[PDB]
């Protein structure tokens, strides 16, 4: 643990360090067979209510089978790469001539085995439920008669339970237009998922890390509905394969830092655009700009790599002071003055401007601070409430240290009355070049006159 | 009621007035206990089908319990303040030493009571269902034998109903990774929600306003899964606490206003960026830029305050004419000419340009209007259809007045051939300063030459 | 079929042609009645468990009825036109005096008929389920007594099934606050949907195209819960009415194209902002900028027209070379250098810059290509994996041709050290005018000195 956090007032940003990493790098496919049984028609016209119930359940089964048969900041630097592609290839291979027959003929004695398709591939296959014996040898031979009669009541319960399970599966396929995410409990039982993870050919540390957080690995999985033929139903489940384990993985937070003045409209200032998760992998650091693309869960930062960047390992240099001519980190200059507040993982940062009232609070002492102009930092050491203007925020509650590096705002260094403004992706060097060009132009203009 | 609407052609904007307000300002927590019963193993190996069904349902119950055990415009001026924080604190307090034991020992005679945790806090607690008696003195003493036999059939139905309820609850926890929104009917019944609202320590007007719109208050609630131990399951439900009631709360709508010309490419014009809900609270007006953050429901504008602003009470000054040097409201200058149409709460605004065909229609008179160049307003007084180019829109149908303030477009005031363009957050003063600087520069250049 | 694709290296873009089109243009409404039966109270206090189960199910029914009674790039050029408007009008007409009584009195002998409301309108009406005979003729006359007793067990199963269906409907209305999308299997079964489609007053080709893709037409539908009165429940289902069929409909894809250099920071370049679906309709082409607004399904591009443009039919002129002074297509000039990759429908485009490593791969030959600086195109003819930096992408697998039009990047034509940059919607003419103005200004400055 030991989640540390630092706040830098030179740029008015916050960094949170201590989180471990778990980065996915590859997909994995598996075939699930739910083999059905062929039913054609019913002929018996009995009077007893049990026959009517069984016939109604069989009609619901047939309707479900027919329906399933008929079913067959800095954000614009990511890429539109497709998500589900391996499952599509697996389903296309399954659609080929006779491969499903080979799979069915290779799974007659054991419910779990390893089957090889055409070309070259190794995919796990798993069989669920059983409908080739109960409905073929027990109910089918008697219904196709003239005087059917069922002298029992538990068979109805069992049949409706199995039909309810299958109908739930087919309705889940029906509603979501053939693609579902995440996989529900109906599609994959917990024990079956554990068996699949155990049998999946990876190392031991990855198995240990993935088997203790089945919720996360279920959240990021996928399902593809596949060919229906030869009395057997098979679909494809796609499970992520985590590739980067136990590396330092920190977080960044930004907030506007503007100078205060009595004159309205002269509030040029600076802001950062490096939100999201920085993280370490290989030799070049990753980058997740969207904070909603992945979720922190139990001191871990499980995150996809499809929407990520490839920044050099020297990006961790402007977090101390944005002066070094080694790497610039995307200033967000503007000319707006609005109060705001952000709640980082351990503390709170309040940028309070103008005449708006901004105060911290407590559960037993009421008002405890009187935040002045500019941006300030309050730590989780006795406060549980921050009010800004006429809106209220709650502060997170955890255990950790809270440092405070004093400094001086950098906006005061910049001279007003000459300032570019309205740059969405200013990178320090660009704004400095613009300032130098403007100064040279005005100097030449006054010298020549 | 009396939903009035006005259209200003000077800037081509629409204002809708008459809506009452309901602004949330604080959260509230409650603890729900669904206490289970401990089951270890089954030994009887009877042959009767009822025993098999009961054993299967008990196995499903145990698997569910084990799985739950293992489970434990202007948009970038809002703030990233956390949503669920009070529930986290309540769960953390519950996780402390022996508090759950105190809660369980204080809820042995009455199903509803008030319990106080450590430090200082007052949280309501509620008990649902009953599984400490049915499964402990009826099924457990007889299953743990050698010759179990159940000579009844309704017990199976009752047990399957209770197990279905509990398994639905645990599956809905399982699928959504431990956080659900909004709370489903399974988690909180109508009677329990009404009892909690009645017992909530608030005034009478808030209770009257919230008890008649239970759908809205259910939509904005939250649920957190909490500690499992000592044969009792408890989780946290978070219900919003509305704080601002019965204040004027109007709506704004914008549309591009551009001049027409025969020459292609010379279509510099102006647009607004004040979409969303203006509203009144305290002494400084609020602001919700996103129109999808909250929903209008039955002449009310229920809206969260986490994503909101703190604009001064003088913002209602550029809605008449954007000339007064008191407050600027964020021009959106551009150099694009595309036709568009917007459907406000009572009428339609169509900005029709170029050679595209744009016409209103009716259900009994066909074509009724022949909208010319520029932006025009059509009211719901005989029209129910607007076609622009090759796309179709339906107009809302309500009852209210429709005014029309004639004026003159303000783009004609601006002189072309010198115009900044490509400013995302121009604020009238900035564009005027740019124009003045350009005019001064060109004047000096021609004077010195 | 024959999905062809071309890649133009002049601007580094990709075009995919061959897809057929299916464009929606209008809505349609239908009334569904689920007529209930009135129940007031229960008086019999029998001891048998069957009476208890029936009473509990009746109480659940009453609670559900009471709950339902109480329930009574280039993205900012689209428009905020309302989605559900026809259903609102239909419900408002239904709410008028006595129309529901007329509908109920006109549907006493046949379950399907055509009824006309006030003013003028023609809406289909449909009746589902039956609760005016089972519960009012069998259970009500015997429960309202002193010594009720039910000597059967199948009635419980039938009643629980019907009550489960009705409670599922009312719960799904309850959770989603009165508006649901898409319609689940509960509100509309397969046979009823097929009957409604067959009875829909449209041509034959549209019926043939829509009856084979019921998933898509169900995905884009809507459901509005409507007036409750006179012991009859009615709601409105809104089904799309496709209007444009069998027209050419192609797709465009873009990727940054930048020059390479050893000096860091001097990497001015150009990018396109014409993502989404171009498509043909009438005489003016449509435009869908968002790629997530509609889904490709089985060689068809079903897409709503609510969020679309009205571009002239001459837009298909800058796809060959952006030089012709006929139409400009929105350059996205910038000054950033980041590697990226995009996976089009048949191939992959990789823009590889700097020191990052970018390689294609294969399942039987390992590394197969060594992509150099700039942007390159790889086709699906032996590759199934693309790695860029430290991230991995899979390539789509289909059948089709892959052309390659060689050329020269246009950014080499532009002379550096004088270049506007930071224009979000540059349109070739604008950047050329800026360049000409800057050149004229500097020429005058050096001539006068």
Termini gap of chain A: 66 Å
Multimer state: part of a larger assembly
Largest sheet of chain A: 6 strands, antiparallel
Name the chain pair whose interface involves the most residues.
Answer: B-C, 48 and 50 residues
* Strands ordered across the widest β-sheet of chain A: 1-2-11-14-15-16
**Count of helices of chain A?**
9
| Radius of gyration over C-alpha positions of chain A, nearest whole angstrom | 31 Å
Shape, per Cα inertia axes of chain A:
elongated
Q: Helix amount of chain A, in percent? A: 25-40%
Structural class of chain A: alpha+beta
Name the beta content range of chain A.
15-25%
Number of DSSP strand runs of chain A:
22
Topology:
This is part of a larger assembly, with 3 copies of chain A (449 residues).
Chain A: E1 4-8, E2 13-17, E3 22-26, E4 29-33, H1 49-71, H2 86-94, H3 99-105, E5 112-115, E6 123-127, H4 134-143, H5 154-175, E7 179-180, H6 190-199, H7 204-211, H8 214-219, E8 222-229, E9 232-238, E10 241-245, E11 251-254, E12 257-258, E13 269-270, E14 276-279, E15 285-288, E16 309-311, E17 340-343, E18 347-352, E19 358-361, E20 374-379, E21 385-388, E22 391-393, H9 429-448
Parallel strand pairs in A: 4-6
Antiparallel strand pairs in A: 1-2, 2-11, 3-10, 4-9, 5-6, 7-8, 8-9, 11-14, 12-13, 14-15, 15-16, 17-18, 18-20, 19-21, 21-22
Structural description of this entry:
The PDB classes it as viral protein. Keywords: RSV, Fusion Protein, Antibody, viral protein. Cryo-EM structure of RSV pre-F in complex with antibody CNR2053. Chains A, B, C are RSV Pre-fusion Protein. The structure is cut from a larger assembly and holds 3 copies of chain A (449 residues). Chain A is an alpha+beta fold and 449 residues long. Helix content of chain A is 26%, strand content 22%. The first copy, chain A, contains 9 helices and 22 strands. In chain A, the strands form 6 sheets. In chain A, strands 1-2-11-14-15-16 form a 6-stranded antiparallel sheet, with no helix packed on it. A 6-stranded mixed sheet of chain A has the order 5-6-4-9-8-7, with helices on one face. In chain A, helix 1 (49-71) runs parallel beside helix 5. The first copy, chain A, is elongated. Chains in contact: A-B, A-C, B-C. At the B-C interface, helix 5, helix 8, strand 15 and strand 20 of B face helix 1, helix 2, helix 5 and helix 9 of C.
